[PDB]
């Protein structure tokens, strides 16, 4: 289809379209990308990551056009530690992604270390709301919690400081123009705190004519909960 | 998903999201349900459906809601013959649905030969649009060719007298207000010739929460083309 568009209000658990992988699960009619105890409580080594079933056709060769989408969704992060960690993302990714092995931690479940640094080996773009950047084990990061736009690397091809409010629900639009390449996030907090990060880039030169979209989080040795509340997403095929 | 919506205006042969059964083929950026030889005419003893891969909700029995949907297609018929059969038709139906044996010809592919008028043994709900009613196959048939709205029988429980126009395409938007129950086909040609039928149904007494929508046609002895041009789709789950 040229055009798809699905809302998720909130999270029944009773889901039919959408794929599971990892810890990631329905808990309260909200996904939790990472493990919790029975008391609900975040625990450490875990990764989890879901996908909407249909596939997304994101742009197409023989008639030279490119998607339009908006991604708009809301999730909160909890800890009893003061650095909790490791973030969660939005991605976007072929159809047959999987949990890359060793892509625990810092590398928020879209990584291999091996490769999590070569542009050249990957095929992802994601925006990460970034909690843990210890300069020793996260040396990729801006020495603070941040918001950043990933382009086939853990190394954000740029980002912005963030702050993390334990237990607030971030609202975040995502939006590509294929006209001006041009991929907009903003993040706001229910006081109007507001946080903007804009990127140019051509999807067709980063991933394939068809991909699937969803997100990802995991916590390393540092742990918190990731709360996926709600998302809605639309995209249509247009001419450029 | 609360709310789902997908749009084809054409058929590209690179589809992810459609599911085919039978003879169903992509040829021309048009779906065709039917076999068809080299020379691209129609052939005999041929069913074809095709079902949009995510599951479509339906109605939600905890939160008592049912969805508002709309269905919009347009669909053309080619035979050498002028007793083309036997029929295209929209259908909601259980996600696992598959060609049911022997349901060939005045069947359309969607009912089995022995619970075919057997309320009580089938799940669906169709919109057919029959071009062959001879009386001895097919005796559940008015004597015209006609639309009709099938609830769990091929046996229409409404229909509409309705005229077959060889390579010409049919306009059809289908619609179903949960608020008031009414299924309604509207269906016209591009010279403004237009066609009602309506049927109140309390789709919840007929389907389960989750099904999967699509299109289904068939030709036993007699045959036809039975072209997909475009189709768009969007439901909203309401409470009433
Ligand atoms: O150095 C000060 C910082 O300490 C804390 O963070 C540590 C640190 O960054 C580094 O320390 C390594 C080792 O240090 C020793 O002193 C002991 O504390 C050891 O236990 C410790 O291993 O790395 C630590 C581990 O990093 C993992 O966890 C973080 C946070 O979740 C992730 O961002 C990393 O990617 C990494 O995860 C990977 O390894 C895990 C197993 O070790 C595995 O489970 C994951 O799947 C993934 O592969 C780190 O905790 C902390 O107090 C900072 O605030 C402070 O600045
Ligand atoms: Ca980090
Ligand atoms: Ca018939
Ligand atoms: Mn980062
Ligand atoms: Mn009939």
Redesign the pocket.
Known sequence: QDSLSFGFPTFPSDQKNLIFQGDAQIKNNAVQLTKTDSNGNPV??T?GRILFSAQVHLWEKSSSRVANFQSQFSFSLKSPLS?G??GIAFFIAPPDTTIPS?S????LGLFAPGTAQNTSANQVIAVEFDT?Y?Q???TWDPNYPHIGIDVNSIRSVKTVKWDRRDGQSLNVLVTFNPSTRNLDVVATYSDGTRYEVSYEVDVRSVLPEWVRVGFSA??????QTHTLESWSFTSTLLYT
Chains 1, 2 share one sequence.
């Open positions: 450490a080594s990764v650095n960690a490791d060793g625990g931690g810092g590398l843990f210890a020793d084990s996260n995991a916590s390393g040795e540092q742990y």
